[PDB]
Design a protein around this nucleic acid. Structure first.
Ligand SMILES: Nc1ncnc2c1ncn2[C@@H]1O[C@H](COP(=O)(O)OP(=O)(O)NP(=O)(O)O)[C@@H](O)[C@H]1O
Ligand SMILES: Nc1ncnc2c1ncn2[C@@H]1O[C@H](COP(=O)(O)OP(=O)(O)NP(=O)(O)O)[C@@H](O)[C@H]1O
Lengths: 663, 267, 661
DNA sequence: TCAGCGGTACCCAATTCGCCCTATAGGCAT
DNA sequence: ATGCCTATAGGGCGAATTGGGTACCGCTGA
């Protein structure tokens, strides 16, 4: 009815870290509430009968109205002792298999709580065998192992080739590519927001083609706005911004006809800012140079005094031409040419043969090998008005350009909203393109955890392959909550597992899903195991402790272990555990044919396998999921198909029938 | 066992007494969150480990008073046994003994206040090693802090080149000015180095160390004997710089033996 | 006694690609000779009775003095058909398991040779069962599987922490970090060049500390020289170059005392450009600004006329102060202040109350909220002499600065040699410091393939592990040419395998190796395997690996059933002990393979003994003659965090399975 | 061909973090 | 009391370090 709960809390410069312990059950939890009200709600929720705090706790207001308070030293909340003590408590070499290793803020609380727990109790605490991170936000729970393995945004090498990004990233502008990458990093699980996107994407499927060229004109407006705030923006950045402003009347017209209130809401957030368009159109030249440094940025008609100091530098070539002409006529020297030099200034060069036939008005400035350059008062006067007018017109150009920041920054906030909205439109319209092109379906969300796929396919593997993906369906529910996927190597069982993982993630960005028809339930935690044991078994334990009734478990080859008796026996207990105790959503791709005796042993487990036909040494993989189990080994048949010599394959078949003669 | 450098001192000695020619002395957070001493000395059996804690004087002076993790493998074919906190289970470790101990401070709030900041406290730990280093030129000592390897005192072969490691302990400043001494009258044998008082600078004046059959004793008798020698060569009586080694059969005569040894070397 | 041999060749803008075939035996091969003489030597070596070339072959001079020549079309040498045709010929889905997939230049020759072979013969040629690439550079042949696994420059995650780089990369300058990294991806096998480094590294062991601070002053001279050649160099780059030039007298003195002819040679290759030192010392200010755009680069005393145009801009503040003072006295307005403005130039500001009390000489330039700014002929005249002198002094600064490229580029070649030598010194002295620091030994090279390690250790793992590395002894030779390393997880299966791989590579950069004593033989190819695909990489190692190659097979047996991976592993081990006789390391969990030392000659049973005490376990981490006693995942499972209740269910299911066997 | 033209990798270079150090007091056996 | 020693904490300076700016690199329809 009512509990006796113990807890602890600590903070750094970043945020807060929290931990608890019930001595009745032996539950030991962790969290990192980032803000204050979240932290106050977490204390209010748990309601510990005894609460720890470090002597130097800054935000004391939280704990000054709580009961059974305990002032503790600082050193007790140090991560060094915390990690060391908790590692020997659980007996592990790391706390990675609790999924809390990279939560040091919270482990300061946990570390201080256990040191205190071992001292408060000093009793039998083997009912404490684990800790787990219960995130303050449960909108989505994703491990870096998924992000690196599924290759959502990043392949194994580190690039973005044959990822879910590469596929979905046909986005015309880079700020669209990034918002796409973030959404995949943070799949929204708020049913309303997910349906907001699915109704948006459905309406733009047809209108996608018209808007996409208009979005490619914008460029990266988001990063231009960043430099605008820093007062480090460049002319060709402002040129892109103006080019983007001209498209807002066009986009407001195309999206006005579209039937989707979310689109009409995005269309208003899109805005127009036709005043800020007018400013930049009048201010800047159509295509100015790279930097402001050497001017030629602000167009004539904007500033009258810019045009004044320009008019001095503009009355340049004609002034020298008429001098060059008059002096060529008067002297009778046709090699006479009036030109500029950065070093000496302007001059009058005459060929060496005609050099000393020049008049007495000319003063020697520069003696050359092939000529004699001179200077005269008219030029040396005109030399001054140019050099200075250049710098002052250019100086006015720097100042005006920085003044344009003072004119744009009043709308800075509204432009970021617009830029985010334009970036969002590129993503949404890009997804609406992908859904239109590949005939992706809209998955609808149910109350209980389960994915029902009808002829579904791997959204990435299908695009790169030179054969249409053998799309296969799925039927997950808390009744059919695990599938033992046996079969061959290149059988497609890691694919059908990873295809299911993307489908869930793609469904949870409100994007149309790679299938004919999907109905999916709440998936809070997407856990994955990545092959290559001290890497493998650590992740599996994390997924045992952390995974819930609602979590999606993606086991790949639990069994790359020291034998076929350790790996099976573990995998066996893991399958039982997730069917008996957790009763969680599990996909168990394995080569342990002995585990195919679990559908008869367990309730919730179901035998499936990947059909393959082998003729001779060559083998062909149907890549189709069938209800049943694997026929036999297939590595022998694959080995040759991977290049392995027939001297090995024959010796494999010769050693096979020496081992297969036993069993 | 009040200063963190004290814990070191005892434990680093504990290795030398086991006949060690390699000492891995390691620390973190200026000796507040790691005190690790690993040796290539003689190991200690699963039997002797238990009641040594529950050298046996010093181990127990820190063991139940800290989170002490004492592991060792006897040179005799065995499996490295390991204790904690009073619990023996086996590790795997080379021939010798290792004490990866965390701060003694546990139930004493006042002993935390006694802590004189840190960095300064690892600088005091350094001095302990720096002293012990000069005492034993046959033992290798690699000193590390925060995981960063700090100082590297490598064992010189018997009657080899002592100056490198000497210079590692006493910096490049002294090494240059180091004038070697070799005095001998009967049972008494004096060895070591002296910086030439002519080129003795403020930086060198930090070095004043005198070792007597391994053990260093801070005795004022020697201060007179040395500052008598530094006065009666050149007029200037500034702060001296020296590292000296006297071997005696197990007072005022020894004072006179010292003085005579110095003045002859300097000229 | 000569055979009928067939060949083909093609070239792109990059280099050449080559292929051959003997119709008697069926041996089909591949190469990419980069230069001409290498390509001429390869034709001369093989000596094909029939030789193919594409109609548009550029360097015809090679083939116009050869016999049985065949002019072929271009499209036949296209990679698309080549890959497609050769894939279906071998029956593979890729040519990755031949180690030629990323050698398209050579596959144009191989592709065109087979299309010709299928047309010359027009019968079944199952004798053609494989192809293989031979980049037999003095450089060791390594698949990227090794570089991603060994973590030479990059760990599994993609960072450069817990690498062999991170460890050995205590290099003071970046150009040292890179030459270190290139050596580790291109290990020298010219035993003479390796001994040149080992004699160098042994001599600098003592002097390592004193040279290292001097090398940290240099900075990245190598990339500064690249910008100097491009005529795009920055003042701060030339400042670093001068700071580096000052260290050359110092380094020439320290290395003169060192006893190593290779060091004395490198010291000469370092050379001295004290003439270029004098130029930059006189020319440039001690620390100039970021760009030449801003001026304030070239120091006074270098150019007379630079200082002339500067002197105009320097007679500024005193001219305006005396104006400000005189005009404040004359008018009787004390709020009168003469200041500069980037936009408008210089001016004379007076407070709004005193603004219209100013004299008739003053012309309005700028009206403010709080004041009235003016301009006068004396200022507007002085305004000209400043603005123009700035630009002309600044223009002279740009020109002089580019002229310094015409003064330095005569030595450009000699500076690259010096920079390479300085970069090489940082590497060598860094390794001399690492070998001094980490107590590394000098491995000596023998005639036949084999590594004899005495209390060796993993050069990376030992450094980052809190506990000491349990040293492992190894004895590889053509007599003991394979080791079945069965054992627990945290047994040290992977460590002792990968420790051996680094030891070989570290020995083949002439650097002192992580061991008490090593004697090593010729290792040409280092081939490695790890879980992400599997069969693809293993096959490459099978086909490519020779009597001399180092094979590092890791858990072959991640298969479809117990039988397909045991049978393959047993066959691959037999193959590499029966046929190929390569120096092979086959860490694995298959205790069933421990029946091969009695089956095979050259195979030897070893294991990483683990003694389980209480509920917990100790791993000796020491290689023992024998095999694994039992399964260890059960013991590890708990150590990976797993609840003890499924470990219990594991032990409860274990004894249901162990009751059979 | 072609002239921008935006991207993109990569070398800085002020900024951030950690290490040193010297005036500034205390400190404790005498 | 006391007087020479001794650690100390803020301040200064140096060493990493990642964002910002630049020179370069294809390249993209036109
Ligand atoms: N449905 C599918 N349609 C077509 N090709 C597929 C399909 N599923 C998988 N593949 C191909 O199968 C190969 C690898 O399949 P995968 O599922 O990884 O094999 P596995 O049996 O899981 N063994 P493993 O490679 O160790 O993971 C690749 O060439 C895939 O493109
Ligand atoms: N000789 C050794 N000395 C010290 N630690 C070692 C040694 N060998 C292995 N280890 C440690 O053992 C752990 C991993 O061992 P490793 O051999 O890489 O794995 P394994 O036994 O092959 N199993 P797996 O993790 O699947 O690769 C790490 O903590 C290593 O530091």
């Amino acid at each position: 009815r009512q509990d006796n709960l113990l807890a602890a809390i600590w903070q750094d410069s970043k945020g807060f870290g929290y931990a608890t312990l019930d001595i009745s059950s032996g539950r030991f939890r962790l969290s990192e509430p980032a803000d204050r009200e979240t932290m106050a709600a977490e204390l209010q929720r748990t309601n510990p009968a005894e609460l720890l705090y470090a002597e130097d706790f800054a935000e004391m207001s939280l704990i000054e109205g709580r009961r059974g308070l305990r002032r503790r030293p600082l050193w007790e909340f140090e991560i060094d002792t915390a990690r060391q003590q908790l590692n020997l408590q659980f007996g592990t070499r790391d706390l990675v298999g609790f999924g809390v290793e990279n939560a040091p803020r919270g482990l300061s609380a946990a570390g201080a709580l256990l040191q205190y727990a071992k001292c408060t109790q000093r009793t039998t605490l083997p009912h404490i065998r684990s800790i787990t991170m219960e995130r303050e936000q449960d909108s989505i729970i994703m491990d870096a192992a998924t992000r690196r393995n599924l290759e959502i945004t990043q392949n194994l090498a580190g690039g973005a080739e044959n990822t879910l990004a590469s596929v979905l990233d046909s986005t015309v502008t880079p700020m669209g590519s990034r918002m796409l990458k973030r959404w995949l990093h943070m799949p929204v699980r708020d049913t309303r927001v997910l349906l907001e996107r699915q109704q948006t994407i459905g309406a733009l499927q047809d209108f996608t083609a018209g808007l996409q060229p208009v979005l490619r004109q914008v460029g990266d407006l988001e990063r231009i706005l960043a430099r605008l705030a820093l007062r480090t923006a460049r002319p060709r950045d402002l040129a892109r911004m103006r080019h983007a402003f001209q498209q807002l009347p066009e986009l407001r017209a195309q999206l006005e006809t579209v039937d989707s209130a979310p689109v009409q809401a995005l269309r208003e957030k899109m805005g127009e800012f036709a005043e800020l368009r007018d400013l930049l159109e009048r201010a800047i030249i159509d295509t100015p140079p790279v930097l402001v440094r050497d001017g030629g940025v602000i167009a004539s008609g904007y500033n009258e005094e810019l045009d004044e100091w320009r008019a001095l530098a503009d009355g340049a070539t004609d002034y020298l031409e008429r001098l060059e002409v008059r002096e060529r006529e008067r002297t009778g020297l046709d090699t006479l040419k009036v030109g500029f030099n950065a070093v000496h200034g302007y001059y009058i060069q005459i060929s060496r043969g005609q050099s000393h036939l020049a008049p007495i008005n000319y003063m020697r400035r520069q003696t050359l090998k092939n000529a004699e350059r001179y200077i005269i008062p008219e030029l040396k006067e005109y030399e001054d008005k140019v050099l200075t007018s250049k710098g002052k017109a250019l100086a006015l150009e720097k100042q005006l350009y920085e003044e344009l920041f003072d004119l744009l920054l009043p709308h800075l906030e509204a432009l970021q909203q617009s830029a985010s909205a334009l970036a969002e439109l590129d993503v949404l319209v890009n997804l609406a393109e992908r859904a239109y092109t590949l005939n992706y379906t809209s998955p609808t969300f149910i109350d209980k955890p389960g994915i029902r796929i009808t002829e579904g396919r791997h959204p990435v593997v299908e695009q790169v392959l030179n054969e249409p993906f053998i799309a296969n369906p799925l039927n997950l529910s808390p009744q059919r909550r695990m599938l033992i996927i046996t079969g061959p190597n290149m059988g497609g069982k890691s694919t059908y597992m990873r295809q299911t993982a993307l489908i869930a993630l793609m469904a949870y960005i409100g994007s149309y899903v790679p299938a004919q028809k999907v109905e999916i339930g709440p998936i809070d935690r997407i856990f994955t195991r990545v092959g290559a044991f001290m890497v493998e078994m650590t992740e599996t334990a994390n997924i045992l402790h952390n995974a819930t009734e609602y979590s999606l478990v993606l086991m790949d080859e639990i069994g790359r272990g020291t034998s076929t008796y350790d790996g099976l026996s573990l995998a066996w207990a893991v399958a039982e555990n997730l069917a008996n105790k957790i009763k969680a959503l599990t996909l168990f791709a394995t080569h342990y044919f002995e585990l195919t005796q679990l559908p008869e042993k367990m309730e919730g487990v179901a035998n499936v396998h990947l059909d393959a036909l082998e003729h001779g040494d060559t083998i062909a993989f149907m890549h189709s999921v069938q209800d049943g189990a694997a026929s036999k080994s297939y590595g022998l048949a694959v080995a040759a198909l991977a290049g392995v010599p027939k001297e090995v394959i024959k010796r494999a078949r010769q050693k096979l029938r020496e081992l297969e003669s036993i069993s | 066992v009040e200063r963190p450098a004290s814990v070191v001192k005892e434990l680093v000695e504990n290795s030398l007494d086991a006949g060690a020619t390699r000492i891995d002395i390691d620390i973190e957070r200026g000796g507040a969150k790691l005190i690790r001493i690993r040796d290539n000395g003689s190991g200690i059996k699963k039997d002797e480990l238990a009641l040594a804690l529950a050298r046996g004087e010093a181990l127990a002076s820190i063991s139940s008073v800290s989170r002490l993790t004492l592991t060792s493998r006897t040179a005799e074919q065995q499996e490295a046994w390991q204790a904690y906190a009073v619990t023996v289970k086996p590790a795997a470790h080379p021939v010798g003994t290792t004490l990866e101990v965390l701060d003694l401070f546990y139930n004493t709030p006042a002993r935390r206040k006694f802590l004189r900041t840190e960095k300064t406290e690892f600088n005091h730990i350094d001095e302990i090693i720096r002293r012990i280093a000069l005492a034993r030129f046959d033992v290798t000592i690699n000193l590390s802090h925060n995981g960063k390897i700090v100082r590297q005192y490598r064992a010189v072969p018997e009657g080899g080149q002592k100056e490198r490691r000497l210079g590692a302990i006493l910096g490049t400043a002294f090494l240059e000015q180091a004038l070697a001494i070799e005095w001998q009258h009967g049972d008494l044998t004096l060895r070591g180095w002296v910086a030439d008082p002519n080129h003795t600078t403020p930086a060198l004046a930090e070095i004043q160390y005198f070792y007597v059959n391994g053990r260093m004793m801070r005795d004022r008798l020697i201060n007179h004997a040395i500052r008598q020698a530094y006065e009666d060569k050149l007029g200037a009586d500034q702060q001296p710089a020296f590292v000296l080694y006297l071997e005696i059969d197990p007072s005022r005569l020894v004072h006179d033996f010292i003085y005579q040894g110095v003045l002859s070397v300097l000229q």
